[PDB]
Paper text:
Hypothesizing that a serpin reflecting a highly conserved sequence may offer insight into the delicate balance between folding and function, we designed conserpin (consensus serpin). To design conserpin we used the consensus approach and a previously reported MSA of 219 serpin sequences. Conserpin (396 aa) shares the highest similarity with α1-AT (137 residue differences; 62% sequence identity). Characterization of its function, structure and folding reveal a serpin that is inhibitory, folds reversibly, is thermostable and resistant to polymerisation.
In order to investigate the effects of a highly destabilizing mutation on conserpin, we introduced E342K313 into conserpin to produce Z-conserpin. Z-conserpin expressed well as a soluble monomer in E. coli, which has not been possible with Z α1-AT7683. Z-conserpin showed a highly similar inhibitory profile to conserpin, with an SI of 2.3 and a kass of 2.1 × 107 M−1 s−1. Z-conserpin exhibits reversible, two-state folding upon chemical denaturation. The equilibrium unfolding and refolding curves overlay almost perfectly, revealing a midpoint of denaturation, [D]50 to be 2.51 ± 0.01 M, an equilibrium m-value, mD-N, of 5.18 kcal mol−1 M−1, and a stability ∆GD-N, of −12.8 kcal mol−1 (a loss of −10.04 kcal mol−1). We therefore repeated equilibrium unfolding using bis-ANS fluorescence, detecting a fluorescent peak at ~2.5 M GuHCl, that is slightly broader and more intense than observed in conserpin, indicating an increase in the intermediate ensemble population, but still smaller than in α1-AT. Native PAGE shows conserpin to remain monomeric except when heated to 90 °C for 10 minutes, whilst Z-conserpin has a complete loss of monomer at 80 °C and forms a slightly higher molecular weight species when heated to 70 °C for 10 minutes. The crystal structure of native Z-conserpin reveals almost no structural differences upon mutation (backbone RMSD = 0.23 Å); the sole differences surrounding E342K313 are small side-chain shifts of K342313 and K290262, most likely as a result of electrostatic repulsion. A caveat is one local residue difference, K343E314, in conserpin that may partially negate the effects of E342K313, due to its salt bridge with K165conserpin. Regardless, the structure of Z-conserpin reveals essentially no structural changes to the native state which disagrees with reports of structural perturbations within the native state808284; therefore favoring the mechanism of Z-variant polymerization via a folding intermediate.
Author numbering: -5 to 312, 328 to 361
């Protein structure tokens, strides 16, 4: 008789899911830019769990970091409402489910997926031509034309397509002066150098030098009650830092940050990540959902499974003897929402 999970349970589960997801991507695609929204992915899977049953359902909840018998829908609704409050970042998310029109959808799923997660389901004919354009145009519309041509290919024994895209360009609480921006070398690796517009700013920032993990941590507050936590590893050993990237480590960092005079150098960069959720969540124990035989009877009585699941996230960033924070080599970052502590984005900039 497990009642609705607490907000604190959701915070723990999503954050564990966030870091385990990064850890997988960092080993899947090394030496590559990483950028994704863990909370967005958690929400999409939680939404699908509305129509999931049996082992299909169990794998999702446990994969998300919850008990098998947990009730997560009340908590997620409240979380999403809080994240999408007017004083927040006002993230525009393309959150849609596309299923074969020949399949009758349960109105309970349609109601709950929209009411609890603001997800929109659609019945479409899945011929590769018209279907791809229809979905891509919708995603483009939902993201104010920022994310175009999301789907590149599409089989046509395709019965169910999950789409989840988000573009983010926030405003700093303390902006960079363009007169202090200067072109500098960004050292991608030992043999590769990229010229970047290096923004600079001298002032008070919450900052911490991690002796143990050999990295610098700095907090950059956004307008909208969120902040970017930038993690700059010392020379070499970015891999060792990634191995230590845990909810525990994050918590230690947040307690260790002190407001200090810092000389900050941050490059202007635009990065993105595009992920096949089938292959990524495969290593997270969520397998049945993406294969035929899945139990999605809560969505439709006809047999159904997720044919394709795509997540894409795009990010644009544009006394006495103070510490220097110069990000002219690959670095990690998180975007954390202040009120809930929710991890909105995780990323790594290798190629700016």
């Amino acid at each position: 008789f497990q009642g609705a999970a607490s907000s604190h349970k959701l915070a723990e589960a999503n954050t564990d899911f966030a870091f385990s997801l990064y850890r997988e991507l960092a080993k899947s695609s090394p030496d590559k830019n990483i950028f994704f929204s863990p909370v967005s992915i958690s929400s999409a899977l939680a939404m699908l769990s509305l129509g999931a049953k049996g082992d299909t359902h169990t794998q999702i909840l446990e994969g998300l970091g919850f008990n098998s018998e947990a009730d997560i829908h009340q908590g997620f609704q409240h979380l999403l409402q809080t994240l999408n409050r007017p004083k927040g970042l006002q993230l525009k998310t393309a959150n849609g489910l596309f299923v074969d029109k020949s399949l009758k959808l349960l109105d309970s799923f349609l109601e709950d997926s929209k009411k609890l997660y603001q997800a929109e389901a659609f019945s479409v004919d899945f011929d590769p031509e018209e279907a791809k354009k229809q979905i891509n145009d919708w995603v483009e519309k939902q993201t104010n034309g920022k994310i175009k041509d999301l789907l590149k290919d599409l089989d046509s024994d395709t019965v169910l397509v999950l789409v989840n895209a988000i573009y983010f360009k926030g405003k700093w609480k303390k902006p960079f002066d363009p007169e202090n921006t200067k072109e500098e070398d960004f050292h991608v690796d030992e043999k590769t150098t990229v010229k970047v517009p290096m923004m600079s700013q001298k002032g008070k920032f919450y900052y911490y030098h991690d002796d143990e993990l050999s990295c610098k941590v700095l907090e950059l507050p956004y307008k909208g009650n969120a902040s970017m936590l930038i993690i700059l590893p010392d020379e070499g050993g970015l891999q060792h830092l990634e191995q230590s990237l845990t909810p525990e480590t994050l918590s230690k960092w947040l307690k260790s940050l002190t407001r200090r005079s810092v000389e900050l150098y941050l490059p202007k960069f635009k990065i993105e990540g595009t992920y096949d959720l089938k292959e990524v969540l495969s290593n997270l124990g969520i397998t049945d959902l993406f294969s035929p035989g899945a139990d999605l009877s809560g969505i439709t009585e006809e047999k159904l499974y997720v044919s394709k699941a795509v997540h894409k996230a795009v990010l644009e960033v544009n006394p006495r003897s103070p510490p220097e924070f110069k990000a002219d080599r690959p670095f990690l970052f998180l975007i954390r929402e202040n009120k809930t502590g929710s991890i909105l984005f995780m990323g790594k900039v290798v190629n700016p």
